[PDB]
Amino acid sequence: WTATSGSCKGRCFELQEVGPPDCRCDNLCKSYSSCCHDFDELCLKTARGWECTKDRCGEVRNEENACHCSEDCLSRGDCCTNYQVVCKGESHWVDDDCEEIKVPECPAGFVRPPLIIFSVDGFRASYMKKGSKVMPNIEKLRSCGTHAPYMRPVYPTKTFPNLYTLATGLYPESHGIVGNSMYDPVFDASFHLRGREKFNHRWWGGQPLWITATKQGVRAGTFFWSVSIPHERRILTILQWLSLPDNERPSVYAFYSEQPDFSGHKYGPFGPEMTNPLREIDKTVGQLMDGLKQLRLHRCVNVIFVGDHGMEDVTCDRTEFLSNYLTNVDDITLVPGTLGRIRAKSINNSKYDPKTIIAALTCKKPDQHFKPYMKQHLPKRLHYANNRRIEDIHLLVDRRWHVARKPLDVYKKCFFQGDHGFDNKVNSMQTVFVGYGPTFKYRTKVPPFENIELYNVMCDLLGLKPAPNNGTHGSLNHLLRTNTFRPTMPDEVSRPNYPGIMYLQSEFDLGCTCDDKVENKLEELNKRLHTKGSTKERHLLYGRPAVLYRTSYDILYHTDFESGYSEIFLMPLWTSYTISKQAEVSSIPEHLTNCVRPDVRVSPGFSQNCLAYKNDKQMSYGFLFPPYLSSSPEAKYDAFLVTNMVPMYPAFKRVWAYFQRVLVKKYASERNGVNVISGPIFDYNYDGLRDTEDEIKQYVEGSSIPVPTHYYSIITSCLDFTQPADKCDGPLSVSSFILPHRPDNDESCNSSEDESKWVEELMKMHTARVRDIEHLTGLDFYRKTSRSYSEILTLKTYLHTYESE
Ligand SMILES: *[C@@H]1O[C@H](CO)[C@@H](O[C@@H]2O[C@H](CO)[C@@H](O[C@@H]3O[C@H](CO[C@H]4O[C@H](CO)[C@@H](O)[C@H](O[C@H]5O[C@H](CO)[C@@H](O)[C@H](O)[C@@H]5O[C@H]5O[C@H](CO)[C@@H](O)[C@H](O)[C@@H]5O)[C@@H]4O)[C@@H](O)[C@H](O[C@H]4O[C@H](CO)[C@@H](O)[C@H](O)[C@@H]4O[C@H]4O[C@H](CO)[C@@H](O)[C@H](O)[C@@H]4O)[C@@H]3O)[C@H](O)[C@H]2NC(C)=O)[C@H](O)[C@H]1NC(C)=O
Ligand SMILES: O=C(Cn1cnc2ccc(N3CCN(C(=O)NC4CCCC4)CC3)cc2c1=O)NCc1ccc(Cl)c(Cl)c1
Ligand SMILES: [Ca+2]
Ligand SMILES: [Ca+2]
Ligand code: NA
Ligand code: NA
Ligand SMILES: [Zn+2]
Structure with missing residues (x-):
């Protein structure tokens, strides 16, 4: 029960979540169906859209408007992001020549450069070159800052495992988010993308960056976002938070975009329809950087532009069906798609046997497009076994394919043309990293690296001690101008004997x-x-x-x-x-x-x-x-x-x-x-x-x-x-x-x-x-x-x- 008859007046996008049954005004309230009655009216204003125009310049403040173009807006921290451009003759950030940021140039009262993580779902690594003509703000970030040719996601190359690895520095087997769908046999409970079980904290292990920051006295903006909040409002919310008094202002912020993943599933990674989502993401980056420039923060904040995984061409016709291999297909539960996980449908069925299922799935067809493994036999580089939520039988699916249990699963679920989830060394699954700001290097290309490493760097950027994780702290020091972490080699614990000839x-x-x-x-x-x-x-x-x-x-x-x-x-x-x-x-x-x-x-x-x-x-x-x-x-x-x-x-x-x-x-x-x-x-x-x-x-x-x-x-x-x-x-x-x-x-x-x-x-x-x-x-x-x-x-x-x- 939520008593939604409380009010969001003065509470819009509050950072501390209030507890049931009191109504909420934070960026996740929509997800819980718990927002106060007046949240849309007060917090999701849309009147007059997102941009200043010449006629609006110097206007009388109308508190109804989505954003402001009145003279007071800069001191209110709520100008439209193009205000100075339209009304004060300033340039867009993207049109300014790159100039090295040798030291933070921050307003008075800033204790440390803030960090903004701009996460893009399904942003395949090759979009940075292939889409560069239509993404000029992202291209400026990339060329002027520090970038890798690609960044390697974790397996499986699915959204929740990777976003939570980015946040924690942990493999999915250790943080516990081992798929977008999971069954935990100890809890006897299921986790899904749809619905509410995923809000229960017992799924989410390790220590994500916002908790690390909070424990060490660094305030954090809220990182998840309810899907229905438009991107323009997410950006304006971050810019408003950045205008908080020093004692209230977070030092770390996250923006998330569901694009280009959402379209890539529909159209394939390079479908002609993909140009528009890449243009729209670039426009969002532009709003953020213009907004930072208005706040005199564009040479103070460190910005990370990072993806969770790429996107491959996959269509319904490239599906292998287990019903074509197993006589007993109704005795198993399969988690399907771009990886397979198999367990018994019933723990009471004593006749279920993993050895016979593996053998029935091994090399049965000349061009078979998946390979079965007991999880302990998966390549060790996947680090995908030590969790009770990972089923003992795993199917590694070839790129461009799906596996499903029966054909009726696929046409009673062609729609889609893209998917992801495959082995994280597959080129189509690679994603992006760009770091831009005073703490990153200038015009610097670094070799590809794994996303498990970035938690430590984010901690370094914020002066935090990382929780124990799977990154190797120091291995990304070459990305940074300052704030490097200077590890010492571990001490040898056992010294060797040097035997001579002692036996006949x-x-x-x-x-x-x-x-x-x-x-x-x-x-x-x-x-x-x-x-x-x-x-x-x-x-x-x-x-x-x-x-x-x-x-x-x-x-x-x-x-x-x-x-x-x-x-x-x-x-x-x-x-x-x-x-x-x-x-x-x-x-x-x-x-x-x-x-x-x-x-x-x-x-x-x-x-x-x-x-x-x-x-x-x-x-x-x-x-x-x-x-x-x-x-x-x-x-x-x-x-x-x-x-x-x-x-x-x-x-x-x-x-x-x-x-x-x-x-x-x-x-x-x-x-x-x-x-x-x-x-x-x-x-x-x-x-x-x-x-x-x-x-x-x-x-x-x-x-x-x-x-x-x-x-x-x-x-x-x-x-x-x-x-x-x-x-x-x-x-x-x-x-x-x-x-x-x-x-x-x-x-x-x-x-x-x-x-x-x-x-x-x-x-x-x-x-x-x-x-x-x-x-x-x-x-x-x-x-x-x-x-x-x-x-x-x-x-x-x-x-x-x-x-x-
Ligand atoms: C990647 O980096 C991570 C982080 O550094 C590495 O993982 C660490 O590995 C350590 C060894 O496996 C492990 O240390 C153990 O911690 C136990 C206490 O654990 C709890 O507290 C921590 C700290 O807050 C917490 O993080 C843990 O979180 C786990 O568990 C919950 C579920 O409750 C999950 O929500 C969460 O996602 C996470 O799960 C993962 O780890 C567990 C193992 O802890 C796995 O089972 C899961 O599958 C999943 O992968 C915990 O809440 C502590 O009890 C252990 O101590 C035993 O062993 C020592 C050896 O020194 C022995 O001396 C002790 O006596 C004790 O033995 C007793 O218990 C045994 C088991 O019941 C019993 O058999 C004995 O007879 C004894 O009674 C142990 O020290 C550490 O917890 C994890 N941390 C994390 C976050 O996963 C990981 O290794 C790195 N990977 C690589 C490849 O390098
Ligand atoms: O944002 C969304 C979609 N979406 C929308 N509404 C949500 C509402 C509540 C929750 N809950 C909050 C309480 N939980 C939580 O705070 N867990 C941590 C704090 C204590 C231990 C771990 C568990 C999760 C998750 C979501 C959620 O995913 N997708 C983008 C995204 C961004 C960053 C990351 Cl890291 C991930 Cl994985 C996904
Ligand atoms: Ca994703
Ligand atoms: Ca071992
Ligand atoms: Na063989
Ligand atoms: Na022998
Ligand atoms: Zn997706």
Whole structure:
């Protein structure tokens, strides 16, 4: 119940929301159907429209008007945004030449430059170039300020997950808004775009920027907007708030536009009908900047122009139906469209089985346009699993397609021509970022970055300490003129042991064999030097990784590679080696095919054993440093040490052996040498974080050898590829992956073919940031480089996407 017979007189767009049953006058009252009886009359004035005209200049103030053109309007803070242009001979902001904003030029009483976030729904990254002729205000923001060619949204590339990630710095699995539609089995409640459950605070986790600001004594304007409030009134409301007395005035404001998404769904991303919505958004930016200029704030405020996701061509005819694959389609609930999420229709149905549903959906049709996954098998870069609102079965839908349960769902719901939601590396899903103002740089282009990073920057712009989030604070310092955040590297928690030769061969009873009894003062001192680290400078280029948790491990040196060997997990945490452009690939010699050699530096008790692999009929092993890339026949023996062995399913060995035998050398050839760091990952609870020993769900049968859930590699070279990886003077270039360690290749529908036709495609799908590997391993890389720490943070957040231009 709302007692809507209270009044909005003197309350229009009040910032503090009043509680039930008292009637409301804030910017969300319409959404709750709770506005006072006189809200439209008093707060949504429209008389005489939104622009001054020559005849209105100097008029007698008429409080009925939408905005004012009387002499008093500037001191009232309620002029039409074009007042000074029409009535005082001033220019529009867009017509003024760009002039660098070296320092804030703010009115007296301003404690800090305000921040205005101007969020555009469905604004695809390529609109900034493709629509530039029809968006002159946005083009001035972009060209004069700091811009990225695009900004990467989070998955799924839907509105609410992305706007709430922008606000919190968190992945959707952590903030809890994992789709536009959700079921939470603990609450037993459903969240929808339509309706009221979405107003319940229990859905919305983390700490959004307006709460962060308020907790730290920075006032915030209200960020959500009721859809029916026209954009011109949203802009005039922000400008009125900016005219509040110092003690009342917010320091952070948000404008939201439902365009161009609304039209893009109807017309497709580049439908001829799209020009007009882009013109209208640009006119809104123009009103805001003219309005700021009238208030002498246009060289004081920092403005962020940012989108939530892009827009792809999608029509009804490109729909896959689950009824074409499943016999039992009425036993499932599907959340449909540009991603699929499946769960049982009834928790009482004991015959429901996810394994049989996955198998029925796997590679069934030659050009099948979705791929099913258990959520823990989704690419780790999506960070889309650790939330009970994410169903166990996920369908990754190809760009331009939908999935639905039955055909009747689609024609009893062609209308639409655009949609979004797909994998967030897809080019059509990318969106925009421009920062303009005293705190941003001038005429500066920055590389693409992820939207999870912007919360920290917004906190920096406002002098706030961010709540804990998934950004990497400091990685966007290159966007800023001032207010940079100067992080320190994390402290190493565990220091390594450096074991020497401590064990005799006969102390080992591992069931291993090697034909190495194959028999010099020149070359014996030489081999001893390699074991003490004489080549370590060639193979550990950026320092050893730091171990950020408590554990016991050993550094092991060799001619061709260095490793940090875990006595707890019985395998390396990391193995590092450099392959020059001139490196030669060789074979595993016949006499060494099944060779595994005890490592006399490491106790039998802290070693793997061959008998466990013989006994485990499902599990084989591979090596982290590949024997194919040994520098000499004699160095090759090091590659067969038991301390270089890791457990690998035979299906996975197909992938791994092709990466090591073919792709490493291909990269070294293309990039002028590469440094590779490879290792295992254990993430049995799919939280994106390193498992402790007591979280390991699978061991090599009969043993204490834990089975990795994934294997990573970080592949680094010189950004200037005229310099070899091992003699690089400047910035680095990286690409990385986190490959799922699976006992079959069902994910790859062409896996019966030669690995040259499917393995690199798999690897691209599982591309990763070095930061993703850091979370998953508790290691900290690139500790010893010539580069600034903020530059290294940017490098650790880089994702190689393998999308065309
Ligand atoms: C991305 O960045 C985020 C933010 O930094 C990272 O997430 C953090 O990760 C931490 C580890 O997973 C996690 O720390 C835990 O916090 C527990 C207290 O949690 C509450 O309070 C915080 C602080 O205000 C709050 O933010 C939390 O909010 C979550 O939960 C509510 C639901 O109630 C949601 O609305 C909200 O969206 C959010 O959900 C997300 O996180 C939870 C996990 O907390 C997931 O389950 C959800 O799926 C969703 O992803 C909470 O309200 C604290 O209890 C934990 O402590 C246990 O573990 C420690 C280990 O040190 C142990 O020592 C303790 O004893 C304790 O164990 C006991 O409980 C166990 C479980 O019941 C039990 O098994 C044991 O036997 C013990 O009794 C833990 O410290 C932190 O909360 C989240 N924060 C957020 C916002 O998500 C995220 O990791 C980053 N991602 C990547 C990839 O880097
Ligand atoms: O604006 C709209 C549409 N619209 C319209 N009317 C609404 C009325 C109320 C609510 N409620 C307020 C109480 N809630 C809330 O304050 N939650 C946070 C504060 C406490 C913890 C998290 C939960 C949400 C949401 C909306 C809403 O979305 N769309 C644009 C937009 C802008 C910014 C963001 Cl971040 C997002 Cl996700 C969406
Ligand atoms: Ca959207
Ligand atoms: Ca984990
Ligand atoms: Na075996
Ligand atoms: Na296959
Ligand atoms: Zn949309």
